[PDB]
Amino acid sequence: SAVKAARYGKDNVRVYKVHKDEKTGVQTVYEMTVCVLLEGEIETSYTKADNSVIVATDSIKNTIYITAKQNPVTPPELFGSILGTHFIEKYNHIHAAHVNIVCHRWTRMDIDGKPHPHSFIRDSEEKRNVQVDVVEGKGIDIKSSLSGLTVLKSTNSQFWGFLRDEYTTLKETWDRILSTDVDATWQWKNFSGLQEVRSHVPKFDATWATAREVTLKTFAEDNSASVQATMYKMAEQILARQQLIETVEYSLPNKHYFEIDLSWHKGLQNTGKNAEVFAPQSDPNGLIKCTVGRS
Template identity: 60%
Template sequence: MATKLAAARYGKENVKVCKVHRDAKSGTHEVTELTVAVSLEGDIESSYTKADNSVVVATDSMKNTIYLLAKQHSVTPPELFASIVGTHFIETYNHIHAAHVRVVVHRWTRMNADGKPHPHAFLRDGTDVRVAEAYVVDGKGVKIKSSISGLLVLKSTGSQFHGFIRDEYTTLPETWDRILSTEIDASWIWAPFVNLNHVRSAGHKFDQAFTAAREISLNIFAQDDSASVQNTMYKMASEILSSEPLLQSVSYSLPNKHYLELGKSTIAEHGSHDDAVCTNNSPDLSWHKGLKNTGANAEVYIPSPAPNGLIQCTISRENNTRATNSKL
């Protein structure tokens, strides 16, 4: 049977980096912890088809390169560092034509001690991470996607869902008040950059856009009287897109985190907008001295991890015909 290598790339992932910047004058430290992945494309077919390792940049060399570049350059903003890493590989090796770099930034927030910021003590005050991805192609510039992932949120009211399709498959009751919880994953794609210097010139915008996206997500989640997750996420994405002219599109992926009233049995998920199945067989609390814990009296809920709804969307500017980049 005749075969050919249709596509190939390889690289190193889970490269852990922690960089400490020390300001000698003020004594203040900045700590940045990263997890970096890089993969390369180019004239590497013979390494697969002919066992020719002469075209292989060892993945251990990739790891060493990431550490050296982290020493020689700032690792913030992560979009710039990802672009620096990707550009290095296509400029250093003539047969490497494209580099994919993904940088995950783990949260370290400065501690307060005795009511004031501590110069060199930090805490992890959340599980969400910042992600930057750069796709660097020889002669074609840099494409960048930024993300926030794993931002877990919950509000105990201010959410409803009613007026949806009811037919022979429907058991979900309509509701005008419920717990809403989700884990926010949002990403935004930037207009293409010509080269690394072009990325540098926009460096301040990356932090600004990330801060705005996180604040917009939290503010709208908290304040919107949500008619549906779909409508709430559309409001979030629209406001992020409006906040930065260099953004081409914004995407959201919001899974439902269900909190079921104790004893309320249903064959459809509570707090979602689709047809997933979730059954709560626990009795309510009326067995104990007639204690009321349903409807307006509900205070105790059961967190239910699965199954869950998953609502997604991408919005772009009306004149942008390509909302996503499959390489990122």
């Protein structure tokens, strides 16, 4: 036997940071969950108990806090690039750093219609994420995403025209509920290193904003032919609005809402145009995925 691949590090490192404007007194908070996995010349830790090649995961954790203390933690694309670059430059034998960041929402509260200087609400469980891969001699690969964005439209979704054979029982519909949890990923052109990542810093928050905005508008306004058709329209538009992105990926569950036939009860009409009350189904769920790039 032989080691064919190996990576190790620290997962589920919770990190909070506050910025305090000494002038205005306005404070701002950031909270993330960070994972850093390293690869490089570490096989001997596995095959011969050689721990000299191991940067202890506890030191990785300390390094995450130290880097957050010494650098901006926003946008997460930048912070993860700084953190992965640190490990491949500090440690001669570490050749790749894989950094995942989950950003948690802390939205400033409005009290009496005015923004509060230091009080915040988790207005939703939606996350903003990055996957930053810093590879020696291969630059910096960033995938940005939003996830846990849960939406529903009560009409203006259709699904008809699908294959029908002896395994098919689904009825065609011209009017149904569509609900999903949006997982949207935009993959950035390769960056040569930290200077290039820094040089594009504004595009990270802009592009996240755009992806979110396009996702919500397209969802709301598309008279959807299918989840497949609607997500492609989302991906297309994002691609057309930020040239530094190479691909857009969607992963969307179809969170089904079933009609309930109550006709058995005093002739009640609750189906088709008369449908008012529905049974949300926890499982199973369709799962629809696509990666869209440039023609």
